């Protein structure tokens, strides 16, 4: 998305951290996924964390 809007804009996003591998696979098929967002100033790449939580 190019900010053709006529002012600065706030943009939120997220990454899903699943409970187990079965969730991971039945949601996104493959494992060892990545989420990468970037702008001119920004560069992020998170590798999600499967784990059993409270």
């Amino acid at each position, epitope marked *: 998305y190019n900010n053709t809007s006529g002012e600065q804009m706030l943009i939120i996003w997220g990454v899903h951290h699943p409970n187990d591998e*079965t*969730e991971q696979r039945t949601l996104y098929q493959n494992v060892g996924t990545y989420v990468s967002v970037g702008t001119s100033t920004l560069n992020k790449r998170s590798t999600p964390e499967i784990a059993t939580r409270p």
Partner: antibody
Amino acid sequence: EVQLVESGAEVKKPGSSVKVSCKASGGTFITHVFTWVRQAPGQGLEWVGGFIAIFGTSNYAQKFQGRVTITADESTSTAYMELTSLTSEDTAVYYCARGISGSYGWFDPWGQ
Amino acid sequence: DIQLTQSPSSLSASVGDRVTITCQASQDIRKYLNWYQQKPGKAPNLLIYDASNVKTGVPSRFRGSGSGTDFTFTISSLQPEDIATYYCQQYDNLPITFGQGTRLEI
């Protein structure tokens, strides 16, 4: 391997109600996309229902919404459609089935 | 809901031929299509999924091909248990449409 036990056979008289069951095993309760297709005397094939157990969300065709509600229980691993206002564009054989992936993939076993 | 069209509703089972059923949608669906078998008037069964790949409870006797609006379910050399009506069905879109049937005899 994964199978699918439905309910009965009993057609009914217009104004009544149905609550077809469909429980499955051969795997864990998540995944499991429960789809339901009905077959009129002789004619085509007609998607009515769905339930996507990961979400707990549920989808219908819109020759219904109002009438049909579909649910489940994880403990009993049992699905559950409920067709109210039961006329004659409602008279068929009602197949439960297992499909895949949120957008209802391919339906791999079928009910008897 | 995006309206399939299994052409034609019945071919005539001349054994061994290039027996080819077609399935033509109301709009582009790319590769999200399935082919179902109904041996005699009861519970259907799945053969080809996702346009050109096979169920692995597998006939080498069969084939799926297609993408655009247009799809094709092929049986080459006929065999005497494959007596059925036949279905194409869809997602990509949302309320799950089918074809009507394509059925041939002995």
